[PDB]
Amino acid sequence: YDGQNCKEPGNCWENKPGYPEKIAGSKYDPKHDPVELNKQEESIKAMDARNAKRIANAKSSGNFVFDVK
Amino acid sequence: YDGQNCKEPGNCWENKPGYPEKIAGSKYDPKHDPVELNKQEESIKAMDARNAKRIANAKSSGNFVFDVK
Amino acid sequence: DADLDKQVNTAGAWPIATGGYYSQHNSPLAQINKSNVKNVKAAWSFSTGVLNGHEGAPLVIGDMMYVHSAFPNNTYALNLNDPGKIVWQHKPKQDASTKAVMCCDVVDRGLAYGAGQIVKKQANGHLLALDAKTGKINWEVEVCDPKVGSTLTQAPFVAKDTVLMGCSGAELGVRGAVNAFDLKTGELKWRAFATGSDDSVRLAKDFNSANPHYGQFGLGTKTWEGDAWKIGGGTNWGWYAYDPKLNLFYYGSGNPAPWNETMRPGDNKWTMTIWGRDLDTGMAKWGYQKTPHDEWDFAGVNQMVLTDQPVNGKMTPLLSHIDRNGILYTLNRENGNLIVAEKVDPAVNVFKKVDLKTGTPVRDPEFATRMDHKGTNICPSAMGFHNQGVDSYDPESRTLYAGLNHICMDWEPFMLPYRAGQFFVGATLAMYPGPNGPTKKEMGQIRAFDLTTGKAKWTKWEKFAAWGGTLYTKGGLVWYATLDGYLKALDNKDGKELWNFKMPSGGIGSPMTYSFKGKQYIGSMYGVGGWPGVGLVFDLTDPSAGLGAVGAFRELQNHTQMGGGLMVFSL
Amino acid sequence: DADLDKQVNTAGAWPIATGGYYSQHNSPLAQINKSNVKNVKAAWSFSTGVLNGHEGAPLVIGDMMYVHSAFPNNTYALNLNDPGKIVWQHKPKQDASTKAVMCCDVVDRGLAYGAGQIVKKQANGHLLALDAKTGKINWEVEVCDPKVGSTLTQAPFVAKDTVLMGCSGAELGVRGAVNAFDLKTGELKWRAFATGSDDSVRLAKDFNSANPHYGQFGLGTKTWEGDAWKIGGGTNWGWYAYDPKLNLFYYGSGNPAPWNETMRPGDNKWTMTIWGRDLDTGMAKWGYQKTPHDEWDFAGVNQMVLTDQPVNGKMTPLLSHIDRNGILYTLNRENGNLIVAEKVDPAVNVFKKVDLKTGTPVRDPEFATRMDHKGTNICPSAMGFHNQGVDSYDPESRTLYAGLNHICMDWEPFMLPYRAGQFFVGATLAMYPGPNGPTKKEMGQIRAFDLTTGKAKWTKWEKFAAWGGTLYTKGGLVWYATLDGYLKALDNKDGKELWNFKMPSGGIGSPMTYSFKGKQYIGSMYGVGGWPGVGLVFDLTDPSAGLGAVGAFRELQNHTQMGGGLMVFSL
């Protein structure tokens, strides 16, 4: 794996000799929990909702307040 | 109470108008707990004992160690 | 915006952390020069009342100076007519738990300015706009969530009516993204992620049209196995650059997560990428991945320096960058063409070289990392041959004065699960000085480079890593602070040390300069910390602790202690 | 011992916190003078890496400087040939709970030196002797027990082969005592209490033979009701003085406990007493109680200054002292004869005057304190018109330059029980500026005095209290640090300000001076704290918090923030 063998432009990864092409089902399978993986997306969704509320209030009341629901 | 009326040399205290000459039994009685009052003395004795052991040991070991008992 | 531009064109002001839109971090002020620098003395000082690493540098707008501290991120405004009075201050109330998810000390790289406001962030993820004159809060919004390991450390960047801000946290699996907010309202305009679908990464229809071999569409998911990209890092916590003419801003995305390379097969795009994005829409015009499938934590967030110089004879709009991987890159900032890719020091061994034709590094298997194997004598180390320091450029001699690190490492990964809010590293390291120091003990260098050839002009060795960076002033001086506590000035011609002063603590920020009432002043923060100071800051003794930095910097405590403040100098 | 005497007689050295055995806190070094002081500049600086109040000043022995910090009481040794290298350091491991029993910030007034050792203490009650060259611990002993509210803050005092050390804690009912330890082994020599039986107080057979009206025997218990003297206070945490020819050392015992005067009828001897004790046996030759039955917390621990001056044409061995109660005292240091007892400022109203014949203050009932009554406009306040500052004396013009406080108060006591290890104050206060400042807001004064008449020669007003004290150098300069952050130099003739420098944080210690390689240096600690800075240091907002100091010093935070370090200056 010298990074010069590309199967597609911009895609030149190769498994190192002795290692699997795919780790799923191997001894290196990370076995990530699907729910755990989506926590960041759920966090941003809630965060964006709180900000939108803050921006909306200040726009109509003319006064900006952080704590609001 | 101007501090100039001394019953004995070096003893010129006087109760202020309306206050008792002795507070024991008055509404200003501190009611100190004899057990609490002796705490300091008890602490100093134990402390002196610990230091004595440290000094003795060092004088008879050429090496000073604090955590010794 | 127009206000910021006015300050930028005002002689003696310092409204931008990197010195200007091009981020050349230099100054035309020449009152202090090679002939009189020996007479420079301390003018005054100011303590922040906080310890830990004090990165960045203050801002000067008109006759006002704005100073910032490490966590809890306090802001102090002072009028230069009387440095003894604090006009206004902002002291955030933050949960102490925030510090637990910060990888590399509770640092803050600085404030920003725009539309008569001081733009400041807090480690806990809040971004605020404060009236520059009164400190009144105009707006405050959430940008990052510490609960999932996301925090804020980099300085905000203002261009036109937009504020750019990126969260930190790749060591906790945080998926990177540059967030854009309205300067006047704090409203989210858009955000461009480092991994994922082309829509989330925000790529223009002509993305990399000039260099198709760099890769184009669908790679944000294709170069990963499954949904590994969701926690694939790529955070951008470094510095930005902006070209008003092209309306493109530039920055680099960070390292992929976890550090264990075996747990994430694939090129891992678009982590470790130099970007050229439209400021208005955030759509990427071009993107070059410097380190496909990182195996060393070479977070590619380093400073982007824009310059205009003749290449082979013709004037060309350039972008230069010295990555953690030890390679000095110079590209056409208009289309992304790769022009220069040279090692900053011959010790670099992770790559044989960077092929300008294929555009990718020719990897040396002997120094790769992988499960069930202990890699040894790998250069650079994860701290890189260049980290968060801001370097300077002299437009006269066309030279970049870089603060480099000369540290290599031993590395071995191990399996671990991902849990939001917890660290997701998966590697044990040991770091030590590189092999080229005069006595094989030196870990820092101030090295001058020609950006069109990538060749060095001179080198000055330092006992410890040159973490903060350098400042260049037209008087012919290169200023920089050391981890051991000195502010120094060198002759830009040969690197000869001309002056120095022993500050209270080591410096990890880059010096700045301004003029007030006709006098030129030099300002530097002090207070050691950051990754190099973790052992000292948190009283660690295990050499492998601090992600392997404790052992390498064990002697630092014999030269400096913690601190937090600003020292200003002048004639 | 002989080693200390050697250092004392070495030009340019600074082996004693107060400047010498007589504690005149001055220096014959005249390199820096009125004609060139304007050219003084910062030489170097050093951060302790600790915040909170940084009292005291460093010691200089040979080419070595020893610096100390606030709690946890770290010690740093530096060779002046290279301030960038810490030769050795001692960083104690102490339980954080120790801070909870300290009344007035976690301060440390300094180190001592004797027999080639650095004598240092820790807030938690330990006293140690370390080799001055290597830092190796020769001996470590227990002196105070935080479990009963006793801690250590004052600087140790070395005379001959004895180390004098006194515990702090009167606000917690700690019975005061001066403890004497063998310089070489740390063995306890004797202990002299402030209250109790004559045997425990250690009174000589001829105690006060020259002034019987001061009181003699049996008063340590007779001037109290019952066993109240057991938790009677009288701690000595200030400064000492020593006369080698008479072999007498001097110091003042503190305030009685609790602050509620109604809970302790009687003169409360021997609290607030000026003592003249034999160094070998600890036996008191004389003792003068300045404030019988304290009603205002005028802890009588202030500096004792020994001078030899003509009184009405008659050369006399004197002892001068400016107490918290606002009275300047001058006594014959041989027999305790009272010579001068004058108000340092006309605002003092707790006493009409001090009668020289009766030897006691003529009390003004209108400004007394007592249960079920709120006293108002009482001057001085509990902070006193003089606190822990170390002042200086010019032997040529025979003038004392005093750092004073101009603060008064409202006070009301309340009943409370005594529980070992817990606070035992019993009073609510409100403090504010005295009535004589130019705008009635000024709380500090530098005032020059003739110690034989008690008359002032000149006054310089300061916005905040002059807490640290002053240093006088033969060049005709009065040096001092301010709470707001400046180190200043005044013309000793008229108090005219000739030079100043803005340090990182306010200073609460007194400046020191030394010589190295033919150059005179001025050193000053910085890092605001102590009682005046409690509001700032602990983020307090209630005006009555901090024993009433928070409200009075509310504006301090608009001038300075916390810090911790040393700054050195020279030509």
Ligand SMILES: O=C(O)c1cc(C(=O)O)c2c(n1)C(=O)C(=O)c1cc(C(=O)O)[nH]c1-2
């Ligand atoms: O992946 C990330 O988000 C992240 C964040 C930070 C940061 O924001 O301090 C650092 C790093 N990585 C990192 O790789 C690193 O070398 C580093 C050094 C420092 C510093 O300030 O000294 N921060 C960071």
Ligand SMILES: O=C(O)c1cc(C(=O)O)c2c(n1)C(=O)C(=O)c1cc(C(=O)O)[nH]c1-2
């Ligand atoms: O009664 C005592 O033992 C005691 C101790 C201390 C101390 O050691 O800090 C202070 C006081 N009292 C006190 O009365 C006071 O005014 C004071 C000021 C300070 C200071 O360092 O600023 N300490 C103390």
Ligand SMILES: [Ca+2]
């Ligand atoms: Ca990283």
Ligand SMILES: [Ca+2]
């Ligand atoms: Ca007291």
